[PDB]
């Protein structure tokens, strides 16, 4: 695939500094869908504002976890079937946390925004298409966690 190469090349730029980039992803996400903010319940407390989340070590650790799952998907882009069972359980966990299926599309748009802003001119419509497809496939596996 030429898509798989576009993904690997674009990810190299981002994975240089995963917290900085994942911070962008989450800041964008809460800008679009502020109702996701209460789902992060560290020590039984909710964040009042999006900027509160950025001072939480647990929240920042979650950004790292996110970037690592995406790294795994990129590493396995040629065959994502090997992550399917893991992603299904990840889906189930997030359903339990309170993430709705519809919110995954917002996460996807936030990921695309982060890529667009990091790559600028290098974020070509083919790169965008490749990432939408990869992310779509991740979500599809995760959505198998919603059957019950
Ligand atoms: C709306 C988006 C999301 C919300 C509200 C959310 C919320 C949470 C919460 C509350 C936890 C449990 C506490 C913690 O470990 O920090 C969690 C765990 C986790 N999240 Fe997310 N999350 C989101 C998106 C994602 C995405 C997109 C990924 C990866 C693609 C991801 C990967 C993880 C991982 C790997 C864990 C640890 C799961 C485990 O093994 O127990 N999360 N998430």
Numbering used by the authors: 3 to 150
Original paper wording:
In the CO-Ngb structure, Phe 106 is the residue mostly affected by the shift of the heme inside the cavity. Its mutation to a Trp hampers heme displacement, leading to low CO affinity. The mutation of the Phe 106 to a Trp leads to a shift of the segment Lys 95 – Ser 107 (termed extended FG loop) toward the bulk. In particular, the side chain of Leu 103 is pushed towards the bulk by the side chain of Trp 106. The shift of Leu 103 leads to a shift of the side chain of Trp 148, located at the end of helix G, and to repositioning of the C-terminal Gly 150. Mean B-factors in the mutant are similar to the WT. The volume of the internal cavity is reduced by 4.6% upon the F to W mutation as expected.
Ngb folds like all globins with a bundle of eight helices termed A to H, and a heme hexacoordinated in both ferric and ferrous forms by the imidazole side chain of the distal and proximal histidines (His 64 and His 96 respectively). The structures of human and murine Ngb present a large internal cavity behind the heme, that is connected to the surface through a tunnel, forming a pathway toward the heme for gaseous ligands (O2, CO, NO).
